[PDB]
Symmetry: D2
């Protein structure tokens, strides 16, 4: 009995996540969407690559939540972009409705699953998925930090002229203005990044990381990033499926860590088959902690709007 | 000095091909398109996946053929779908113009490259690319058969209930009506496919292979297949870069094989760093040869229309 | 949780098999041997390679069968060496005692395991393993054919000038004089090997395959082959762990197939999570049957010697 | 054409390194040894695994240096074993003669190669290799630090309860008493190791790392480690062949870095197609410098013994 991964929402992120996972033979994959034909087509297309690439995975597309039953991991990409005229609460509302509909159908069919959210606003939707599923909180998480850390690591590897395999970095919070950069906690083969890159340039790289998603949006003209978001999501799925105990920034439920309670927030975790197996507590200095507290206030504000719906 | 692969046309097939190649660290990748922003965005997005996936490849996007210089392989996906009102010659004409423009700019900058075409009509455009580049014909080829054989192999593995790693198949010709199926030349770990699958069902699978591209089109609603076409293209690129001597059906220039002269046609080849290193001559029976001759007449008809432009 | 594989016998074959399973992150690995220190040493050495090779599995060396409990697959490599200069009968007696000691201790601790034997004489020892374990016959198999076919495929690829990835071959029986070669059931991308290689040369390749183990012994002057034997064994382990439904020659228990009853014999099977999920019955011609019947007589005589102990 | 790697010394380390390079299809491999039959045997065994493992590279065993011509990398593993019970000085004399014979024959045949030494005493033998070859110093390096760091990272990952993929560590000097441990320059996803592991336990881990080679020797009772030593060596080979710009400790020729001149010593470098492309100069504190200075004195004394031969 192979592992089973269901991916909800068969757009660019969801389908690319299926590609990364299939390539590694990580388990059978169900791609689900509301639109008829689209998940069926992408799934069959990917499956037809399998003799070339040498993986034995069933990739199927479906419009029926029944086909997601007994999944080991559920990935949710479904959501709604904002566009003009919408208020903050309007954007939160439409995504909350989408998230509730997905989780309320999927979770009871896979009571042992780890749920990985990849929609927006990420921390709030992960908080909602935890409420709706009623799963142990360790088993409901969100992907945000692995992507931002990946962009940062790319920029560092680029600038320092070194292998991307040798750059590691931790950060916290959400995306853009809510990101909590922590360049002190990044290294190249154990050596502080700040020994390779001077402060002014490092600050530019931190800012580029903040703006990294919008950078891609501006280039693509239509649509958002998907190759790296899907890679980040897939690395998380892998950590769960193989119990790898990866140390990653992940949206997790806090019970006093960093002085925060009753909130999902991007924090360093050990991630394995149990989901969040540890929340790590970094010795942040006053400047770093000021960044965290400001981000947590913003994340709290979004969460309060969700609760008031 | 890492290998260098340029991919012309940064749509679904071109960008997915970059993904398959990057994942295998096969060389630095240039993604080129006429549209500003789009190749830049997809390329940077893929590059930002690299610390997660562990590959050291430069992936860059560009609108400038100068950036393609000194490539080891050039992949061309650019072309034009037909839609209504267009005649046969009209469709051939617009793709010929696109193909000429791509090859005339790219080929002189990479005089040692192998050119791999993945546009339509595939055999005719490959014939044109050979004329325009003036390269040795062994170094100008087209991807068609690896995809159709992959779909067939998937269907066989599905039906027989066996690993896709154990199914192998040769076929000839082009796509759909121009495909020349050869189920006699397919095996599961050395054992004829016909020992696993009875004639009526095997005929259904052959027909499904013929219709395999349109199957995906019908499901997707908008757009065509890309995961498997890109995998096929990337496997060909790999064969060249690593001199693997893969035995594959490929659109190649014929000088008497199967009784055909002065034509590109899908035939079994040994594919390596020299491009086509051998054209294999199968002992086709009368029924198989009748299929080939009918397909070659159709491919000839397209080629004659190209020549008359 | 993670898959678990126990490998009994920490010699070259056992240790090299462990390396393969671990590199691929196929499961936690227990390496057991009677000699204190040796399995612990090899396991720790392999484990210390993990941050370089990027795998997260436990690799335990042990002298205690208790550490093998609840394994998904048991591999047995323990066996008297070299065809040591004793009688054929002496070899069977010493290996029967080893096999009985190994299986009687390991089997009760892993009642749902698939057992894969890799000692000598291969078919007889697999028969004894079935007897001692009491397991369903589908779950006790022997590795022999995958190695012999690998050597054959290597020789074929080299001679035909093609990729090893494109050569398939089925064969039957045991090793050496007991191998039943089947060049009719071998192909290159679905094309008969006989179309590439002339009959005299092919006969040489067949003979080289029979003598292939001894060719390696003679070169080394001390010890036997282990790289290809371990790869063959690991591939079978993988087939079970990932439920891949590989089509392979393996030593299986026969109940009438090919006219053979109450015997282990190398036959084509579908191998998956259930062990042998199907024994395939090839339409062997008169010549091929003569080879098989002679092979079986010899395998029977080995088995009868075992039964008379 | 394909990359070419020659590995001198067909023992456990050389043969296992070959296995790694081939599995990854990194280039054609030549395994050379003085003993007739042994390298031919090991090479053929490895080659016969290729259709199972899916790699297309040539794997040649030889007694003739002519077969190593025009290699991209030369790996030297040939060396007197075990710290054999002779004097320290005896060990240097025997290995100096072996190293001189190896380098004087191989270097002129591959004038553009990078040489990677893996014999003992490591720094001295790499110094001698530079002398005998006459190659630019950047192209003659020794593998030691990558192994010692791998053992350290293994121990750290196990103790902290995290993925080996997320642990980085830099260290300097040679093996054993000459290792310069640097736990300050080690991290888990960019976070200082000191935050995870208490000082007393970390000190134990450091000592285990110093004794790590001997720990393996004592368990095995015959022979030394080879899995992790070969992985470390292969990773360095890969860094050169794929121009990955890895940041690694390697034995490099010093001209003033860390106060050291005219000596080979384990230092952090950027390693790529050009060999050592940069020697990094860490801001070592007073305590760390004392370790380094003592290490250097000892490495100097080994070197002076070599110079007095
Ligand atoms: Cl231990
Ligand atoms: Cl040979």
């Amino acid at each position: 009995m192979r592992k089973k991964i269901s991916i909800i929402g068969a757009g660019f992120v969801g389908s690319t996540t299926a590609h990364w996972l299939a390539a590694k033979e990580l388990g059978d994959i169900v791609l689900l969407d509301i639109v008829e034909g689209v998940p069926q087509g992408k799934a069959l297309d990917l499956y037809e690559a399998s003799p070339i690439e040498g993986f034995d995975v069933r990739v199927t597309g479906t419009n029926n939540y029944a086909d997601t039953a007994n999944s080991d991991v559920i990935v949710v990409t479904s959501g709604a972009p904002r566009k003009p005229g919408m208020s903050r609460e309007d954007l939160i509302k439409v995504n909350a409705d989408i998230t509730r509909a997905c989780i309320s159908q999927a979770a009871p069919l896979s009571p042992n699953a780890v749920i990985i959210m990849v929609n927006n606003p990420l921390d709030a939707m992960t908080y909602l998925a935890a409420e709706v599923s009623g799963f142990p909180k360790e088993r409901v998480i969100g992907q945000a930090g692995v992507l931002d850390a990946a962009r940062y690591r790319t920029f560092i590897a680029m600038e320092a002229g070194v292998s991307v395999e040798d750059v590691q970095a931790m950060l916290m919070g959400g995306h853009g203005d809510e990101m909590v950069p922590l360049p002190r906690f990044s290294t190249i083969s154990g050596i502080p990044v700040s020994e390779f890159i001077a402060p002014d340039r490092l600050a530019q790289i931190v800012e580029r990381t903040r703006k990294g998603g919008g950078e891609i949006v501006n280039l693509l003209k239509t649509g958002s990033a998907y190759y790296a978001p899907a890679a980040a999501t897939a690395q998380m799925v892998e950590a769960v499926l193989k119990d790898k105990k990866r140390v990653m920034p992940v949206a997790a439920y806090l019970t006093g860590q960093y002085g925060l309670n009753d909130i999902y927030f991007g924090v360093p975790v050990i991630l394995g088959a149990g989901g969040v197996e540890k929340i790590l507590e970094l010795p942040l200095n006053e400047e770093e902690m000021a960044l965290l507290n400001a981000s947590a206030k913003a994340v709290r504000a979004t969460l309060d709007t969700l609760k008031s719906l």
